[PDB]
Design a protein around this ligand. Structure first.
Ligand SMILES: [Cl-]
Ligand SMILES: [Cl-]
Length: 278
């Protein structure tokens, strides 16, 4: 790491996402997050509990004395806990991101784009359903209900009957939150040997065993151009920390990471160690 925190100079909001702009050695840069995190601002204010952060951002009061300094200091801990610089966001910059309905509506649009591109749906066979969904979002109907209803009505013909609607909902939600690629393919639940059984929580080790996750070796993967593909329910059974580490180990070795809504499994076509105890 060069710096363990960076000051957010500006923000822009578009398509249910926010871009946080900062200077990195004289180079104007940004990181992207979903707007979801920026309605309840307090999950982002550094609390007393070590906890962890949903994303690598800390919000602070710009008028307050010692709230920036406390953030900068707290973020030399958080930067090590999550292996990312922490962006320090003056809460003044994120006062007008849209209404909680305006947010719901914009995220919903991203869910639709991902759903048609993923299952190859003509955007025109959706628009009656989309119009209905958006109208209910403005009546404060749960985003999570609107999406589930939309999928139940749009899936027929396009989504294999052996895929549960609730696994599609959850691919879509997670795909927009962390910008993860979504496929319908069979899962392999492979993860890189980089993440070690030894330091896993019992939840983590138990959960990997439960979905028959298997360790793969970096050069074996890079050689066979092997996508790591996780069933979304099995992926979300892991700890948030572990989920990030699996994905960052993949992106460093330039291996595509995909969530799937399928519970069918890839052929074991490669040297894989399956997870177990010692
Ligand atoms: Cl329904
Ligand atoms: Cl993320």
């Amino acid at each position: 790491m060069d710096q363990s925190s960076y000051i957010v100079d500006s923000v822009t909001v578009k398509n249910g996402s926010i871009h946080l702009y900062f200077d990195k050695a004289g180079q104007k840069t940004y990181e992207r997050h979903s707007l979801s995190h920026f309605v309840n601002l307090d999950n982002l204010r550094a609390n007393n509990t070590k906890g962890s952060l949903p994303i690598n951002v800390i919000v602070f009061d710009g008028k307050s004395k010692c709230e920036e300094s406390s953030a900068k200091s707290a973020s030399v801990y958080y930067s090590q806990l999550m292996c990312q610089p922490i962006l320090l966001l003056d809460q003044a910059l994120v006062s007008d991101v849209g209404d909680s309905a305006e947010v719901a509506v914009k995220m919903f649009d991203a869910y639709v784009n991902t759903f048609s591109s993923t299952f190859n749906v003509p955007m025109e066979k959706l628009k009656t359903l989309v119009a209905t969904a958006e109208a209910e979002l403005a009546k404060n109907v749960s985003l999570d209900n609107v999406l589930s209803t939309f999928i139940s009505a749009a899936r027929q013909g396009f989504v294999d009957s052996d895929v549960e609607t609730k696994d599609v909902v959850e691919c879509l939600k997670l795909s927009h939150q962390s910008d993860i690629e979504v496929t319908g393919d069979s899962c392999n639940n492979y993860m890189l040997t980089y993440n070690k059984v030894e330091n896993m929580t019992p939840r983590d080790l138990g959960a990997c065993i439960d979905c028959s996750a298997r360790h793969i070796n970096a050069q074996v993967a890079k050689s066979h151009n092997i996508a790591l593909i996780w069933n979304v329910k099995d992926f979300m059974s892991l700890s948030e920390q572990l989920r990030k580490q699996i994905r960052s180990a993949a992106k460093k070795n330039n291996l595509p990471f995909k969530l799937t809504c399928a519970t069918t499994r890839q052929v074991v076509n490669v040297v894989t160690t399956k997870i177990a105890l010692k």
